Amino acid sequence: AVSCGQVDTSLTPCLTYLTKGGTPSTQCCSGVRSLKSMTGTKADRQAACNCLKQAAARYQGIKDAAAAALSQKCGVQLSVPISRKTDCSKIS
């Protein structure tokens, strides 16, 4: 079980980067690592994906480019996309 509270809190330090781009903070990357360690089941990955979809929809300053590069720039293999347009049901 993962809540949007858990998911949104983990990426709270990433908002600077998500809205401006450049380089994520150490705490942002620690956040992305927390996200990966909490989404080991398909249910948790789909729940995470939905939470991050809803957050990207509400936070209008999020750059889609920055969202799609966040896991790559943190060195994290994160199996959850971050976009207001993703079909979260199609996630493995």
Author numbering: 1 to 92
List sentences quoted exactly from the publication behind this structure:
Act c 10.0101 crystallized in the P21 space group with two protein molecules in the asymmetric units. The model was refined to 1.95Å resolution. The crystal structure corresponds to a closed apo form of the protein. Both protein chains include residues 1–92 (mature form of the protein) that are folded into a compact, mainly α-helical structure that is characteristic for nsLTPs. The protein chains adopt very similar conformations and they superposed with Root Mean Square Deviation (RMSD) value of 0.3Å over 92 Cα. The Act c 10.0101 structure is stabilized by four disulfide bridges that are formed by the following pairs of cysteine residues: Cys4–Cys51, Cys14–Cys28, Cys29–Cys74, and Cys49–Cys88. We have identified three additional amino acids at the C-terminal end of the protein and modeled these amino acids as Lys-Ile-Ser, which is consistent with the sequence that is observed in homologous Act d 10.0101 and Act d 10.0201, as well as in agreement with the results of mass spectrometric analysis of the sample used for crystallization. The crystal structure revealed that Lys90 is solvent exposed, the side chain of Ile91 points toward the hydrophobic core of the protein, and the C-terminal carboxyl group of Ser92 forms a salt bridge with Arg45. The covalent ligand binding was shown in the case of oxylipin-conjugated barley 9-kDa LTP, where Asp7 of this nsLTP is responsible for the formation of the bond between the protein and lipid. This aspartic acid residue is conserved in Act c 10.0101 (Asp8), Act d 10.0101, Act d 10.0201, chickpea Cic a 3, tomato Sola l 7.0101, and wheat Tri a 14.0201, which suggests that these nsLTPs may have a similar mode of ligand binding and may also bind oxylipins. The difference in likely modes of ligand binding for Act c 10.0101 is not only related to the presence of the conserved aspartic acid residue in kiwifruit protein, but also the absence of a tyrosine residue in the Ω loop.
